[PDB]
Amino acid sequence: WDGKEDGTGTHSVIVTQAIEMLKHDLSKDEPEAIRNDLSILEKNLHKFQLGSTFPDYDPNAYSLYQDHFWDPDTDHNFTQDNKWYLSYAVPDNAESQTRKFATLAKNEWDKGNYEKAAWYLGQGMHYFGDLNTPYHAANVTAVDSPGHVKFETYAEERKDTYRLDTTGYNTDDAFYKDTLKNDNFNEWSKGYCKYWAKKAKNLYYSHATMSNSWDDWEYAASHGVGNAQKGVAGYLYRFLNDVSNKDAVDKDYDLNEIVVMIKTADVQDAGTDNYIYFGIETKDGVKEEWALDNPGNDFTRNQEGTYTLKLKNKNTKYSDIKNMWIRDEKLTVATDGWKPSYVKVIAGDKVRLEKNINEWISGGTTYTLK
Ligand SMILES: [Ca+2]
Ligand SMILES: [Ca+2]
Ligand SMILES: [Zn+2]
Ligand SMILES: [Zn+2]
Ligand SMILES: [Zn+2]
C-alpha cells in the first residue's frame, strides 16, 4: 500500500485504526496489563505511524523492494519465482520481515525503549500490510503491471472510507484467542500471514487485475484495507500478551535459520569489498559458515543489511551453539579496514545478541561474538 515518509497514508491509517479497533474489542475480562501496555503504544503512536511507512523510504531498501512481496502458496517473493528476476533473488520476504520486526520490537520493549519498540513494530506492521495488498501477495510488480501503482493510488485516495471501528469480535472470541494458542511465535506468525495473504491473492485474481472494473477495484481495496486493519489488531493482541504476561512459560524450538543484522558506521573508510562471513560452532563441534552477500552492495558506509542464514542441520537449538563469529577475508595482500557499528542476532522468537562494535576490523581476521 501507499505511504509517505512523514507517517501518513494508507499504511498509517491501517495501523492507527487497528489501535482503535483493539481498544474497542478488548473484553471486560482482559487484564489491566494489556490495557496499560496498549496505552504505552498509544503514547508512542507517532513512532508507530512512522514505522508503518518507513520501509518504502528506507535508504537500505533493495532496488526492487522485493522483500515487500510474498506469495503464500510458494513462500517466495517475485525475484525467486519469476525467471526474469532470478539474479535479484533475496530470501527476505514480507512474511519474514513482519516477524523480524515483531521480534526486534519485543526486545526494545523488554529494555523499556518504548519509542523504538513502537517504531520497529510499525515497520513490522508495514510488511504485514503489504502482504494484505493483492498485487504484493500475487507477486506482481510495479514493472509487470502499470495497474499495480494505479491500484495503490486508488486505495490511497479512498483510505478514510475503509476505516473499521472493530474486528467484529472481542478478545474472548476465537479471532483473538487463536493468536495466543501457539507458543511458537515464528510458526504462528507465518501461519497467520499465510491466512491473510491468501485472501489478498484471491482478491487480486478475482477483483484487482488490470482487466477488472472500477467496482471490482473498490471491492478489492476496501476488503484489502479492511483485512489489514483486522490482521494488525490481532497481531497487536498477540504482541501485547507476549510483552505483558509474566506467568507465561517460555518454550524452545529447533532453528530453521539465524537472522543476522549488521550496520556499518558512517565514517571515512568504514566500508569494505572484502568477503564477510558469519559462523557458529555447536557443542558437538560441528561448524557452519555463511557468506553475507545479498545482490547489490554490502558493507558500504552507513549501510544496514539483514542476512537470513538457513541451517544445514535440522536438530539444532540455540542452546547448542557454543561459538559465533564474523570473519573478514581479503582478496589481495593489501591491508584494508572495515568499521561495523553493530551486530544483532535473531534465532527463534528472540534477539539473542546485540553487540556494539565501533572498532576497526582488518581483512584476514575473525571477530568473536560468543
Ligand atoms: Ca574500508
Ligand atoms: Ca552483494
Ligand atoms: Zn505498502
Ligand atoms: Zn506496491
Ligand atoms: Zn511496502
The residue segments making up the domain with residue 290 are 250-370
How many angstroms is it from 116 CA to the middle of ligand 3? 21
9 is in an annotated binding site: no
| Ligand 3 geometric centre to CA of 132 (Å) | 9
Query: Which among 249, 267, 297 is the end of a domain?
Result: 249
62 and 199 inside one domain:
yes
Cβ neighbours of residue 150 closer than 8 Å, sequence gap 6 or more: none
Residue 216 is assigned to a ligand binding site: no
| CA 2 – ligand 3 centroid, Å | 5
Where among 249, 266, 284 does a domain terminate?
249
Residue 58 assigned as binding residue? no
Q: Is 11 annotated as a binding residue?
A: yes
Query: Could you tell me the resolution of this structure in angstroms?
Result: 2.5
**How many A from CA of 46 to the centre of ligand 3?**
18
Residues 122 and 213 in one domain: yes
CB 236 within 8 A of CB 22: yes
Ligand with minimal distance to 152 CA: 4
Q: How far apart are CA 93 and CA 101, in angstroms?
A: 12
56 in a known ligand binding site: yes
Note whether 241 and 278 are same-domain residues: no
- Rounded distance, CA 255 to CA 231, Å? 26
Range list of H helices, 245-281: none
According to DSSP, residue 54 is labeled G
Torsions phi, psi for 311 (to 5 deg): -85, 135
Tell me the C-alpha distance between 144 and 140, whole Å: 6
Is residue 103 located within the same domain as residue 146?
yes
User: Which letter does DSSP use for residue 74 in this model?
Assistant: T
263 and 128 in a common domain: no
Asked which of 184, 219, 249 is the last residue of a domain, the reply is: 249
Distance of CA 78 to the CA centre of its chain: 17
The domain that contains 344 carries what CATH number?
2.60.60.20
Smallest CA-to-CA distance from 310 within 20, 43, 91, 71 is with 91
- Cell numbers representing residue 290 in the block: 555463511
Strand 275-282 with 321-329, pairing: antiparallel
Say which DSSP state 297 is in.
-
Span from the CA of 335 to the centroid of ligand 5 (angstroms) = 40
Q: Determine whether 238 is exposed, middle or buried from the number of CB atoms within 10 Å of its CB (0-12, 13-18, 19+).
A: buried
- If you measure from the C-alpha of residue 64 to the centroid of ligand 2, how many angstroms do you get, rounded to a whole number? 15
DSSP string for residues in 76-111:
B-HHHHSGGGGGG--S--HHHHHHHHHHHHHHHHHH
3-state secondary structure of 191: helix
Put the strands of the sheet holding 257-264 in their side by side order: 304-310, 257-264, 340-347, 350-356
Point out which residues pair with 282 in neighbouring strands.
Answer: 321
Q: Which amino acid, one-letter code, is at 71?
A: D
223 is in an annotated binding site: no
Residues 296 and 348 in one domain: yes
**Chain-centre distance for alpha carbon 360:** 30
The closest of 105, 122, 123 to 114, measured between CA atoms, is 105
**Residue 181: C-alpha distances to residues 134, 178, 231, 314, 368 (Å):** 28, 5, 16, 24, 38
Q: How far apart are CA 77 and CA 82, in angstroms?
A: 9
**Domain tally, the chain:** 2
CATH assignment of the domain containing 58: 1.10.575.10
CA of 268 to the centre of ligand 4 (A): 35
Task: Give the cell for residue 20.
Answer: 482503535
C-alpha 317/C-alpha 283 separation (Å) is 11
323, burial (CB in 10 Å: exposed 0-12, middle 13-18, buried 19+): middle
The DSSP bridge partners found for residue 288 are 280
Here the cell at position 8 is 501518513
Same domain, 237 and 105: yes
Contacts of 92 (CB under 8 A, 6+ apart): 62, 66, 67, 77, 306, 308
Residues 222 and 259 in one domain: no
Burial class (CB in 10 A: 0-12, 13-18, 19+), 333: exposed
Does residue 244 share a domain with residue 369?
no
Residue 56 Cα, ligand 5 centroid: separation in angstroms? Answer: 5
d(CA 359, CA 327): 14
Q: Is 294 annotated among the ligand-binding residues?
A: yes
Q: Is 271 annotated as a binding residue?
A: yes
Alpha carbons 175 and 224: distance in angstroms, whole number? 18
Secondary structure in 3-state letters for 201-212: HHHHHHHCCCCC
Q: Please tell me whether residues 173 and 298 are part of one structural domain.
A: no
| Distance separating alpha carbons of residues 31 and 164, to the nearest angstrom | 24
76 marked among binding-site residues: no
Same domain, yes or no: 239 and 283 = no
Residues in contact with 191: Cβ distance below 8 Å, sequence separation at least 6, in sequence order:
182
Pairing of strands 337-338, 361-362: antiparallel
Distance between CA atoms of residues 94 and 36, nearest Å: 29
Place of cell 499495480: 148
Answer for the pair 279, 327: CB distance below 8 angstroms, yes or no: yes
Q: Are 259 and 346 in contact (CB under 8 A)?
A: yes
Tracing cell 487480486 back to the chain, one arrives at: 204
Strands 361-362, 304-310: pairing is: unpaired
- 98 with 244, same domain? yes
Cross-strand bridge partners of residue 327: 277, 366
Are 350 and 255 a contacting pair, CB within 8 Å?
no
Cβ neighbours for 51, distance < 8 A, ≥ 6 positions apart: 7, 15, 101, 118, 119, 120, 121, 122, 123, 124, 125, 126
